[PDB]
Amino acid sequence: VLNQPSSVSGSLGQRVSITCSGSSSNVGNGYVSWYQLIPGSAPRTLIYGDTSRASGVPDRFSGSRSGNTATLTISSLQAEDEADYFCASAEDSSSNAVFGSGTTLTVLGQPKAAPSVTLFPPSSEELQANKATLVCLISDFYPGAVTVAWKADSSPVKAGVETTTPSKQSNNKYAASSYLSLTPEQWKSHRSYSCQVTHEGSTVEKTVAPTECS
C-alpha cells in the first residue's frame, strides 16, 4: 500500500499538501495518480502521470514526485474540498495497480452553529405493531463534535441506544441521529424521556412524554 498521511487539515483559502510514499517498484517507477472521494458520489480522477491534470479539474490542484514520494497540493482551499484523497501507481506491470492508505481532508474556518434538535416519539403505527423507537434528530451544527445521552425519568439510559456518526448535510453543516429502541411496556413504565445534545459546553435537551401527544 502506498503510505499516505492518515489525516491532514487545512484552512479556507490556504495551501495544503498530501504525500504518497511507496518504493522503487511502484512510485519509484513513477506515473502517479490522485483521486477524490466525496461521500455519496463516485470517485473522481484528479491527477495522472505525476502531474497531468484531468479535464475539468481546476489549476489549484497540482501534483509532483521526488523519487519514491509524490505530493498533491491544493491551493485556494475551498469548502467542496472536504473529502478523502487517494494515490495510485502501477507495480511491475501496467495492470497491477497499488493504492495508498488514504487521507481525510478537513477544511476549517467555517461559521459555528448550535444544533437544532427534534425529538420524535413512537408513531401510533409503530406502537400498534408492538414496537417503540424514539428518534432524536440533530441538525445544522458546526463543529461536528456532539454528544448524545438519554434520560428515562431523569435517570441515564445506555441500553437500546444507537447513535450515528455525524455527517455533513447539503448546506455543509453537520447532522446526526440517535435511536432508542424500546418495547411498549418499557415506553409506558416511565413518564418522560429526554435527549441531551452537548455541543460546545451547551446542552440542548428535548423531552417527550407518552401521556401527551408531542
Binding site: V1, N29, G30, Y31, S33, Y35, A42, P43, R44, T45, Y48, G49, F86, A88, S89, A90, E91, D92, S93, S94, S95, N96, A97, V98, F99, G100, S101, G102, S116, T118, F120, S123, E125, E126, A129, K131, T133, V135, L137, S139, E162, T163, T164, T165, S167, Q169, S170, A175, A176, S177, Y179, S181, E212, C213, S214
Partner: protein, 261 residues
C-alpha cells in the same frame, strides 16, 4: 456520454461466488480498457483486475487465484467473478475505463549517451572499443483510471434479506419552530443495505436530509429521512416519503400527516 453501470446481487452467502456485470454506454469496448476496483467499509481502495482491447487480463496478485474477468464486445459488457467469498469481501464495487501503457525507457552508464547504443560523449569513432556500451532498459508502467461508474454495494453474510418497515415522524403542535416544521419517515429493520428515500416523488428537494443507517444488535439496519417544510402548508399540502429497498425489490410510499395536537 461515457457511462459504466454495475449490476448484480446485493447479498451473497459465504463460500459462494460473487458475479457482477459492467454495462458500458457511449464508448466501444474495442477501444478502451476496463478494470474493477473495490473499497471495503472504512478501508482503502483495492485493485482487482483489468482487461484490454486484446482481451488480455491482469489481476491483483493477492487475489489472482479467486478472480476472473471476461468481455463481450457485442453486448458491450464486462463480467467479473470472485470465488469463495467471505465477510471480508463485503464492499462497494466499481468498474472503470482505465489507461495502461508500458514505457520502455533506457538508461546509460555515466559518461555515455544514447546514440543505437550508449556512446561516450566525444568518441568520434563509431566502433571504437571503449566508446560504446549496451543500453539497459527501464520499464515505466503507466496506470490511471479514466472514468468511473456509480458503484454497487455487495454484502457477504449468512443472514437473510428483510424488507423495511416505514413509520411516520409527524410534526405536532409542540414540535413546530414558527413558520417551519420538521417531518420525516422511519425506515425500520431492513437488511441488507442500501435503502434510498425520496419525498413526494422527488418534487420536494428543499431541506431534505436522509440520515445514515445504524446497525442494531439484531443485525438489521435502521435509517431516517426528514424534510423541513413551511408550517403554513401543514394541513394543506400533502407530504409522502417514497422509500426504496432494491435488495428486496420493495417500494413503500408512506404519507406523513401532521399530528392533530
Amino acid at each position: 456520454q461515457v457511462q459504466l453501470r454495475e449490476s448484480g446481487p446485493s447479498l451473497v452467502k459465504p463460500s459462494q461466488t460473487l458475479s457482477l456485470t459492467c454495462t458500458a454506454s457511449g464508448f466501444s469496448l474495442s477501444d478502451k480498457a476496463v478494470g474493477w476496483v473495490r473499497q471495503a467499509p472504512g478501508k482503502p481502495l483495492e485493485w482487482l483486475g483489468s482487461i484490454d482491447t486484446a482481451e488480455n487480463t491482469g489481476y491483483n496478485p493477492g487475489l489472482k487465484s479467486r478472480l476472473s474477468i471476461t468481455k463481450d464486445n457485442s453486448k458491450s459488457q464486462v463480467s467479473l467473478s470472485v470465488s469463495s467469498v467471505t465477510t471480508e469481501d463485503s464492499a462497494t464495487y466499481y468498474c472503470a475505463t482505465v489507461h495502461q501503457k508500458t514505457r520502455k525507457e533506457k538508461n546509460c552508464p555515466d559518461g555515455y549517451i544514447y546514440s543505437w547504443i550508449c556512446r561516450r560523449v566525444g568518441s568520434a569513432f563509431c566502433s571504437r572499443t571503449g566508446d560504446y556500451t549496451s543500453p539497459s532498459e527501464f520499464d515505466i508502467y503507466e496506470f490511471y483510471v479514466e472514468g468511473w461508474g456509480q458503484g454497487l454495494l455487495v454484502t457477504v453474510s449468512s443472514a437473510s434479506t428483510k424488507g423495511p418497515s416505514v413509520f411516520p415522524l409527524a410534526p405536532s403542535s409542540k414540535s413546530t419552530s414558527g413558520g417551519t416544521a420538521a417531518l420525516g419517515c422511519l425506515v425500520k429493520d431492513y437488511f441488507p443495505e442500501p435503502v434510498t428515500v425520496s419525498w413526494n416523488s422527488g418534487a420536494l428537494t428543499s431541506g431534505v436530509h436522509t440520515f445514515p443507517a445504524v446497525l442494531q444488535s439484531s443485525g438489521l439496519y435502521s435509517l431516517s429521512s426528514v424534510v423541513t417544510v413551511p408550517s403554513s402548508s401543514l394541513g394543506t399540502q400533502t407530504y409522502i416519503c417514497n422509500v426504496n429497498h432494491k435488495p428486496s425489490n420493495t417500494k413503500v410510499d408512506k404519507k406523513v400527516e401532521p399530528k392533530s395536537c
